[model samples]
Target: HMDPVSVWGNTPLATVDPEIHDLIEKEKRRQCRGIELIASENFTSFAVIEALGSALTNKYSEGMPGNRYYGGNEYIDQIENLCRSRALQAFHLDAQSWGVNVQPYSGSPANFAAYTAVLNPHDRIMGLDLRSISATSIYFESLPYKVNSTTGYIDYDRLEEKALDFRPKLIICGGSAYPRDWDYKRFREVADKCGALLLCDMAHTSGLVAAQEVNSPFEYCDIVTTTTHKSLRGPRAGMIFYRKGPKPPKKGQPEAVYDFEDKINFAVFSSLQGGPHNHQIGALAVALKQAASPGFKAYAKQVKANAVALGKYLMGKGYSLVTGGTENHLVLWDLRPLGLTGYKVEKLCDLCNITVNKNAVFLAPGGVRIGAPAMTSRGLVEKDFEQIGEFLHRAVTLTLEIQKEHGKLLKDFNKGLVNNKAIEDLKADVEKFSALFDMPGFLVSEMKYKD
Candidate 1:
């Protein structure tokens, strides 16, 4: 009866810390009751969540696989190695030519570790945003390249001209909000011309690349980084893929000379991050294994289809998309033409239990970045997205009407938002609509209550 340590290892969260556990439950309920349209969010399998919460988290192995800083790490090594192999296999990469480090804590850290591998602290890097990808703005000088404002396509010729002038040491290709395929061949051409190492941050589209629905970054870039959480539907972790042996020469600069294999490995383990997350690696392994299946491919296709359907429906309603339409799993919906801003629209979405993010587009900061991966994970198809499109259109019009009542008391840069019957009605409708779809990670009724 006085065994104080009896439940030390086996205590249920509900019995031990009801407040924190209950908060988690509340979040789960909110996630269940909402329509998730955030571009960077996704639904992971319950198996992935189970792996993340496993006992493997107890260990602190602070080094590479097979050579840990601690003992009792033999099994951790196997899990991490399996994760690396599965990651490579998902991309159809040959182990001899390509290698991956499944150790970075997340995509930014992965990019940070990769930069430490081949770059000096003050070296220049270029991407769509100076502050995007890898937190490079803190350590490196960055120049941003822009998309053509009218077409919403990357201005490749302009980028070439800017690249030759800037001559950055590294050029990052990819971002969180772009809605089209990356012109990797053009990026490679610019990288070759400017003598910069090309890195592609494929965090937003890694799942599509895995399912062969989008272009792969492996064939052209020197480094690739992705968050397993986004479309990969894994844990909140990251992986860095680096070229080994011989790098493709930049305009006959050199051949079979520079290789990032050893440098990147050393950077991730010794210089950059410490104590890799074993549980995260295990969950990523699970997700990657599933990513290799035919089911994941179909999921990828459905995600792409739903995005286009959503975009088309919105466009038909006279709303503008940043690129006119979507070629990937997201659409940048420009609300400037309707005399609306993304902030107000996103706020309205929040009120209506629909989640989306305000994003800065080439022309304005009035675009909402909507994506398909999350809803598709919940079994939503193109027709469902078309229905969602109608919901969104109604919300936009509702936003216009609410402004007539609330614009007097709203902020200077923002206006047109307040609680009214219209939003409450929409919120209830969304709750019912979203509940019809199944979520993958948890079942509220199925959760065990501690005895």
Candidate 2:
């Protein structure tokens, strides 16, 4: 066996190992040639990618910045501390007002550790029941809530009633397929009434929060968690934030209180995680810096604008969007009205080089979840999204027509060849439109690596 080596020269990755390197290059080409509409995906800047692949990955820092269990982490401490500070700054908050932990690896683990820090096992928790891909249902006896069946919007009145009825210990706000901005004040009202700790998982809306495009959860939430990848446009990681407040004292101890920050550090380090991913934290710092810029604010605003434009255009094409439109970067397209399933539409779009995810819509069989953050970051505006919406409508319409032609089982529809001229033309159109925009970091002046 030989030692792992890093690429140094201008030679492509294929020079090192042909198989894995080829797959990566192929993925790069695919991304460059397609329109990504997956609600949870985004392209990070080159600076973030550089930091993710940095030498810091070799380190093993097992504790908080200054109080690490291992040695040789002075620089690691600086990197982690910078991540925490910049995170607060990115959201326009003071360090003393909040605490941030940049070491939960990803969103699920961050959420798990947050629950561990704050609540005991089997404590009732409430969250929006938007999809089956969520982890909250599996962990901590979850009493999931839902949106109004007819309107497709969260019925805060019903949610408040559920919270008061169930009296959950923790109440979570946010969901994977939810397309509207949360009314944090309303959430706070319910949580306060039920004496429940409010945890706002802003993994999907962190960029909007940073740009102030939506309401800030910081002022209302007892604890907030976000993934750095999605709208934050950084490396794939998560952070937890809590106001600098005192945790209630343990049993048998005299009346005393401790900072929630200390409990979070314990939960992440002693309870859930082993060592922090230093390279990811380094990338998070860079992303945080980028997110604090005025340009990122403009990008954030455009993401919502593009989503609205695309959603309205899709509705005009005879497709129904959840809630009729979106106030965020994603829109859920309900295909049931056209007698379609998201499973088929997803494959059809893939065939046309348009990437989208098949997701579960509340009370419906399935729907396609589309988002604008990726393209918005790649320099696309509302007009571009409107055109993409038309492309999607064409692809979906063609797919349904083909399905209608075949009287066979719906499962077998995707197994056969789709060599129709309509699909070919749609693919060609997507190729042309995709060529007009570059991936976020590719060939950008500000993202160039500075020696």
Candidate achieving the largest lDDT: 1
Compared with the true structure, the alpha-carbon lDDT of candidate 2 equals 0.83
lDDT of 1 by residue, 1-451 (tens): 5557747657888888999988887788777778999989999999999999999888677756545424588788888889989999999999888899998878887888899998999899999866634468878989999889788899999999989999999999988888999999999999988889999999999999999899999988888999998888889999999887665544555536557888888888874344888899999999999999999999999999999999999999988999889889999998887777788789888989999998886744677899999999999998999989988998998988866655623473244454467888888889889878787999856543311
Worst lDDT run of 10 residues, candidate 1, spans: 408-417
Best by TM-score: 1
**Superposed model 1: Cα runs more than 4 Å off:** 1-3, 67-71, 132-134, 249-258, 271-274, 412-419, 447-451
Q: Judged by lDDT against the true structure, how good is candidate 1?
A: 0.86
> What lDDT score belongs to each candidate, Candidate 1 first?
0.86, 0.83
Question: For residues 1-451, could you state the per-residue lDDT of candidate 2 as single tens digits?
Answer: 6444444544455675678776765677677678889888899998999899878888877756444524687788888888889999998877767888998888888888898888887788998882225455565678878899888889999999989999999999988888888889999989888888999999998999999999899878888999999988889998999877444433455754435687888898864355878898999999999999999999999999999999989988888998889999999988887778887888889988999988777643578999988888878998999999999989888878777776335666754435678888888889888878767655522232211
Question: What TM-score does candidate 2 get on C-alpha atoms?
Answer: 0.90
